[PDB]
Amino acid sequence: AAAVRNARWA
Amino acid sequence: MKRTFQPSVLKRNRSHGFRARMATKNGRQVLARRRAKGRARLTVSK
RNA sequence: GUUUAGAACGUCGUGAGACAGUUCGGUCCCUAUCUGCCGUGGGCGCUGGAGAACUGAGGGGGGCUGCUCCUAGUACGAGAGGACCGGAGUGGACGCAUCACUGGUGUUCGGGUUGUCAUGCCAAUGGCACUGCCCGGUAGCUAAAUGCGGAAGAGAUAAGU
RNA sequence: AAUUCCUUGUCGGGUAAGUUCCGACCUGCACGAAUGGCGUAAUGAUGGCCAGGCUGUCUCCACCCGAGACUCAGUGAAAUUGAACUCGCUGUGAAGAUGCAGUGUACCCGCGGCAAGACGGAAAGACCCCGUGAACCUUUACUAUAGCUUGACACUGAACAU
RNA sequence: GUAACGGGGCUAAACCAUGCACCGAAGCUGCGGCAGCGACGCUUAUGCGUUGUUGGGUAGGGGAGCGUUCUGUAAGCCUGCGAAGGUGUGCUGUGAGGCAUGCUGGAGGUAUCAGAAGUGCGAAUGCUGACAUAAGUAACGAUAAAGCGGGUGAAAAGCCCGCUCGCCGGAAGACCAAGGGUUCCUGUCCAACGUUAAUCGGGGCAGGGUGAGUCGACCCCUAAGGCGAGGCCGAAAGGCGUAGUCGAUGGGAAACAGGUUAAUAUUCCUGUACUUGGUGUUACUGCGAAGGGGGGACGGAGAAGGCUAUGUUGGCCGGGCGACGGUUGUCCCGGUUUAAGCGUGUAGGCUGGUUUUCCAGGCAAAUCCGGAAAAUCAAGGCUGAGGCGUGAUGACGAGGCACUACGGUGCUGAAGCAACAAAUGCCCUGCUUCCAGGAAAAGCCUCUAAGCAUCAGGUAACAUCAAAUCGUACCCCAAACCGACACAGGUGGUCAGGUAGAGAAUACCAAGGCGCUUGAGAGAACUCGGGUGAAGGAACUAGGCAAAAUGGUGCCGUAACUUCGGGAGAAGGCACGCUGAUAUGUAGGUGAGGUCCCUCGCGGAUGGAGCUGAAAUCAGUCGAAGAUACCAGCUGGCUGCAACUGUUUAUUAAAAACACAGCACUGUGCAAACACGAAAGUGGACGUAUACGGUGUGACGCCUGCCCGGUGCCGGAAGGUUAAUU
RNA sequence: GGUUAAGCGACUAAGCGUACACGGUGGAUGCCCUGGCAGUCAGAGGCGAUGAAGGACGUGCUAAUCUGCGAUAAGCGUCGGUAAGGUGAUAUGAACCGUUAUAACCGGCGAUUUCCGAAUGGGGAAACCCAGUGUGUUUCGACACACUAUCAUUAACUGAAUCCAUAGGUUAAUGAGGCGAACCGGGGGAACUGAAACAUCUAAGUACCCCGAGGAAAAGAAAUCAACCGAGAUUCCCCCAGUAGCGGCGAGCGAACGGGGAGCAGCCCAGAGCCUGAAUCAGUGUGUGUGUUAGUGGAAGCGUCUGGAAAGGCGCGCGAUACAGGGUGACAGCCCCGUACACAAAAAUGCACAUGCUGUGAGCUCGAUGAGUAGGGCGGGACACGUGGUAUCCUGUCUGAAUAUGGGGGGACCAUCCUCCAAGGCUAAAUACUCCUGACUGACCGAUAGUGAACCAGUACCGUGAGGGAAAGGCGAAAAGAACCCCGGCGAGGGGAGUGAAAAAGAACCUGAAACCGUGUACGUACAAGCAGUGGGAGCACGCUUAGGCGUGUGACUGCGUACCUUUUGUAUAAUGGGUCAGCGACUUAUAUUCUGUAGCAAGGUUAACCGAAUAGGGGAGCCGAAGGGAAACCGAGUCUUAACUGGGCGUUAAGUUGCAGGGUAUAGACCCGAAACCCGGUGAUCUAGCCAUGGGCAGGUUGAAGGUUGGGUAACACUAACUGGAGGACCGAACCGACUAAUGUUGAAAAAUUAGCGGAUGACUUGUGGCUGGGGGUGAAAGGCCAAUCAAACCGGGAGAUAGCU
């Protein structure tokens, strides 16, 4: 399995 | 790092053994399903 | 910093919560195929083969400047003050090369020393402990060390005469 | 002020220079007394600020020791991939071009490197919006309901006093 | 990057005004071909010099076909003179296609006209299988380290042997439990497995290997808890639970040393023991419970004392006279080991002891326990290390000679002592102390009931039997277990050598075990782990992040503030090596011989030999440096928050958050409130308001003001309003 | 000719491209079926304390596994069948047994039948542990059998409080326990979904859970319907009819009367006689008949040709109540097994008829005629019917009759009239289903299909567990499975040889495609810019032709030319999709309705169930059409509207109906794939959180509380000094535990770690072994944390193909 990171602008 | 599986024969037989399963009808229904499915190993007991 | 989940203040809301209000804490991945770029090779071509030295089409680098001195305390100015032009000297920044000097390093050189082990023992050595810890140090590499560079001069010109 | 929007408020201290810190001021945008107020020794991998020591943190990097990177031998992946005979510029164009137009440049092919671009790779976007989507949670949203509570009847009968 | 003619270039190759040419499209016209449609000429379901006209096309509508599998046609036809399938070639139709053939293959295939569909695939981050790409690139798994000679082999960096080197040594050693299940040993083999090769292996293959009265398990006994006759409850299922019955992680009988296998051993062998039952004999005889009592039987912390394990030194025995100066010496090396059991009962710990008597108590009884009195004894009893003796004229033992397959085998075999130090082990389930006040049962001991008291049974001494069954190899902080891996991770217990050190830290070593399953070169950038650094010293940066620095013991000295404890190791400073002297090895510790005493022993008092051994001072001496390495606090000042130790988002947040002691409010009278449960019941609690639950606040200090309108809560009940019911 | 100069200049291929040839990899295509799928006709619908289902371990000449079997262990006895061969399979071999009937094999009936499992002597972690009693054994150590669970029922014996009694207790007899597919009855009972939301409603009394029974079950013999005529139990089918109705009158739900069929069966008690054992039923024996469980016979061909082989070809025959099929070296009526027909049972058993016993009562007369019930109030449920004006049925609650001179019903209610007699029971058939047995069938599949499984498949494997769950078929006719030689490591692999029709069938074995990867040849390619092709085109190579030149391959050079799909106003777009190949993969099916086409009949058309030797025929029950208008009564080629229409609305000349095909619509999953979720039943506290029980661990070094003693002080204290003491969620710091900072690593050594530092380290510590709390629940010093790498509602299965106006 895995995960994600929203470093992008909100 | 300690994982989810720590072997214990006494605990394993007391939890899923033939006599533990057959004590209740719900476990006895598991045996009926496994007998109907034709499982080679009915319970976890050796 | 903003921009998650934690928490708190003020504020809003009955409340859950909310606030370009504020406070504290809080995971930034990718072994380069292609283009591009910096280097460095292989292949073939250039009309016999081969070894050298060149011409320079073309391309790139480089192009900064201060302060003193002389001109001259002259021109200018009542004075206070104070040059143009031109010529010297000495710096800053930048760049290149170099290690003679000044230094760094020099776990491959020499020495001192702690603990312990070994070489039968003593003595003398060696191993290990960050090179055990230190003191020095050749060559090399290196800068903070020291040499050099920016130009002058032409051609055609900009604005302008 | 963990609270002050205006705001880096004003004054003082600290610095060569302090939007932070410390002391005050009160003008409390929008503090406040057990959703505690103010103080408080000690404690804190607590937050902010200052000083000494200390240093390659930095001015400004140099050298050295190892492990990789490089070469040889052996074994031998991966994400990705429409197909490629996969240059620059200007312009155009589902509006930021290796592929179109024009034009320039460029012998064929490796190796070591750097990551500017291939709107690079990763994951049917978490922000925004939408669906008469989902879920939890809140309440004086709706409709109910467990529970709690009221009375009648039944279980439950007979004297007396008001 | 010229970039505002597409470019070149142009003074007309621009613009303006006239012309005549030419170029220019799938438009138009020619010359063929196909198809749709309209009214005709004859003929017309067909069709004819027809003719006119139309034919871009998504969504979509209409129409006509191809091909695939199957059924009828088809018990036909095609086919070992080569069917289907595959792979080429040729021809043909507007198309989906069709026809034929060469080769492959070796047994099916199927005309025609109808019928039926799992009837046509490039996409769906489609599904399954196969194969690419990156790519011979990354990686080959801790930087603890390897090297050589020899051997085996087809082949050796990796296997075997040997000699060095390096690593661990509170582990990276040894022994277990749990867990695994043969991985153990031997032989054999190198496909696959091993991140390379491999002769090797935890790989393949074939054999062998696990021996118990005493170790465990089983067994007896109970804890939490489970199950649970009857029982209670619940639509059914079922839930709870009594008597009971299970359930160790706990309590209960007994074995040690030596030797031995390729692999097992407190299990086999040797030697020497022990225990519980059964049976028999003999003697003496009150036995007896589903009963009673005792016992089992229990905390934390701390303090020593007595010991042993163990270590050191000396002595003794054996060996050595040194590859290079010295080494017959106070020299060097090695050894100096012995259990359970039995006897003694020691240091020490605990308790007064012994009779008689009574008694509504211990569910009845009791001779026991618990009570009441009286007498008399100055003791007695219990427990317990260790030592010593025995075990043991034995075993073991350096070494020795002979044989032999490097093993080995056989024989022999000296000394086998003392002092000192010393545990975290033992005495100790003790002692002392504290509050938070620290299992059970059975075995065991004792007491009597009923039921026997000739008997049985009990006690004692012999003899004798019996002690079954199961586990036992091996790994067990790891390549064998948990992590997909021969995985830098995790995993409980036991053992605890030397030097230095307070120490189980740390460094170097012993025993023992390893060098981590790809290497060999090269010595770029860059990256990682480190070393050093002129001068400056936080100018860096959000921030002294990181690094550097500090670091020990003794002594001196130490502020604000404080809850008087602290702050405090505050800060700051001084002394540390070696040698000698005091004092040839001191103070101290230990303590033999000897000499007295004993109602006599493991005795007491003297006594000081011999060992062990700081600390200080003085003097000398070496270095730049003596806490020299490793190891090992940076410090101070102001301030916010939280009192504090603690807890928390396993896997980006350890905080000011949560908890917290304390405080207050409120509920709760015990069949308590409350909570879990359709209920029974259970928790609360075997507690009782000095208690419990809920809520908020959050040590401590000083304090906590005003509002009851709103919303809740509490109390009242006259009136208004109001359900079922009648 | 030589020397210069200028111009031009092929030949090079490290490699690459295209074409062709030859291979490798791979297992598609085709062919095949001892496997599946759907059915038809029958049978059989249970097994079990006489120990089941399902297993464990054993058992052979046996090393493993499979299949059998159970210590009598691939088997023993007996009775039949049958027999010349035979000791199950992988799977040979060895050692043997048989051959005319005790080899073997098949069937009937027995014997044996370890251990676990309802499991039953007790216990237990299933295949293990521990007994008691009694009988019988003796080698005095022991040994062998038997019995000993619980509950229900019955009968004995004993036996409390408590005098009898009763409860209770002890025996002894019977019975029940469990397993199993669907169908059936009953007790409980969803949600997703639909309503384009969502409450009533729908889904649905479905899924699921629980209880019980049978081969069927259930229902069942009118207090029923009808309507003034009548019908006459129940069940099932076709109609009636998507009608009447129900319904936020929305979605949707949905009869009955009556008719046509299948099949029909009626009785008993509520009581006594007169008769009498009557009919009938059940037990059982006793035969017959017909099955079942082994079996027997079963017709008829040769020659020649091709070919490895004949069943094929070409000839000439023969059988057929047998030309159903299978096998045999290619396609067999006559080769083989069978098939059609004709036969068979020692023993067991089914079915049916008859008969004998054991029960069982038939008939007649006179009586009797189901009361806390009907009904009612309240609250619900069931009837198509949701409270509505709601009859009828069931009742949680509260009441409560009449009783034949009486009650019930006739869809509110009343009267009248019909009809029936509740409050006690029994009852076959027609109906539903298939775990299982046998035979047969298919415009069903043919190894990615068909069961998940054609193969040692519910296996390997995954998960703690519930549970999930694969991949994998083909040599040839016969293994004749390659003797021997050679290379190699006493290998692997390969070359010969040999076998065979073929090895171009060699076990990596039928056919062997494509992607992909090679070797060879031809051509092109090292000054050349881009979807890589197209139009033109030299040259070279090559095949034909005869010089007409065509054909093939390559292609210098040149004009033109920015992939495909999806989604869009618009994509070369720097928007989505795709590494490639092969295989698979999406508009179907059922019913109804409308329309079109077509066929038949026609003012008619046509049947459905069912019957039926049965695609025929029967059955016209019904359905549509020929007449409409109106709300309806009604009227009618008219009718309604209105008082009435000269009117107006709707109708009146116009052919339909039944098949078949097709286009739509409707209900079902409805073209395929995809949610996050909701609901139901289970599995998880071997991880983690808390708690419970029982054990363990915490080197070393400091600080020095209370208290105590001894002084000083006080009248005594207090106070003070010294010395003892050893207090603490005390200090420093290893083990141990935590995880604050930074670096590395992030296709990890590791799906959270390592290195250097960091905090705690006698406690609210830490740890071992057990135990307990379970999913709207747990647990939580509280973060929405944790509850098996998953948590704002775990996991598994089911509803389920939820739904998806979206892609």
Ligand SMILES: [Mg+2]
């Ligand atoms: Mg921030």
Ligand SMILES: [Mg+2]
């Ligand atoms: Mg940060």
Ligand SMILES: [Mg+2]
């Ligand atoms: Mg970081």
Ligand SMILES: [Mg+2]
């Ligand atoms: Mg980065």
Ligand SMILES: [Mg+2]
């Ligand atoms: Mg030099």
Ligand SMILES: [Mg+2]
């Ligand atoms: Mg150096």
Ligand SMILES: [Mg+2]
């Ligand atoms: Mg030595």
Ligand SMILES: [Mg+2]
């Ligand atoms: Mg070293």
Ligand SMILES: [Mg+2]
């Ligand atoms: Mg120097």
Ligand SMILES: [Mg+2]
């Ligand atoms: Mg100039």
Ligand SMILES: [Mg+2]
């Ligand atoms: Mg000039």
Ligand SMILES: [Mg+2]
């Ligand atoms: Mg000018």
Ligand SMILES: [Mg+2]
């Ligand atoms: Mg501000």
Ligand SMILES: [Mg+2]
């Ligand atoms: Mg200021």
Ligand SMILES: [Mg+2]
């Ligand atoms: Mg301030």
Ligand SMILES: [Mg+2]
């Ligand atoms: Mg406030």
